[PDB]
Design a protein around this ligand. Sequence first.
Ligand SMILES: *[C@@H]1O[C@H](CO)[C@@H](O)[C@H](O)[C@H]1NC(C)=O
Lengths: 55, 175
Amino acid sequence: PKVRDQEGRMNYYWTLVEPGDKITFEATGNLVVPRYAFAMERNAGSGIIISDTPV
Amino acid sequence: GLFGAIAGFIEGGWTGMVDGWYGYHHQNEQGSGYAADLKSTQNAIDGITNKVNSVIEKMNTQFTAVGKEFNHLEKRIENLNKKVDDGFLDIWTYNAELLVLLENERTLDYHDSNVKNLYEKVRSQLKNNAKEIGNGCFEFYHKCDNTCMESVKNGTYDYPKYSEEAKLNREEIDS
Ligand SMILES: *[C@@H]1O[C@H](CO)[C@@H](O)[C@H](O)[C@H]1NC(C)=O
């Protein structure tokens, strides 16, 4: 059924790559290749606040 | 009052005494006025401050994010997460309400005990040289100047010094 005028679906995926590791992509089609990647260090804890209060 | 001093045999408090919690009202030929007992007042302030500090400082926490996000197919753990939050809310609320209720009762009795002790300390110093007349008041059978007055506040009243002066006056007031 049409969702935002689309009848096809796009399933997104993610993973974390540790230092000294390689990620390999292989496809004959139906692949959305990455363009930008983020290097990050997670901070333990913290959450997400959902409110209209300004910052 | 538990000890019967505050709102007991001392019917009311003094607004003329502003320098302390417990103290004295004296009267002699040199005049009259209000004074606060430094020793008993400071020892009660320290206990109350320790009481307030104990309630607050013993509560030590760490960094923590309460917020948890779940989808529409994770209702059970979402209900489990809500059950954890609600259970903590009920436990903390009941303890906090009862802690204030019980400690407020203890604090008022603590002031009652201190007032009673101060009266008895003065009573032990004067012995039969003074007559109890209620309202936490003493009447001296001998003249007591400013030096004699604060000597009771000091805690250094000389019973034998005025023992014979007061004894002679004791047997004449009562016919
Ligand atoms: C006790 O009070 C009297 C009142 O002036 C004073 O003479 C004496 O020095 C006092 N004792 C003290 C302050 O240790």
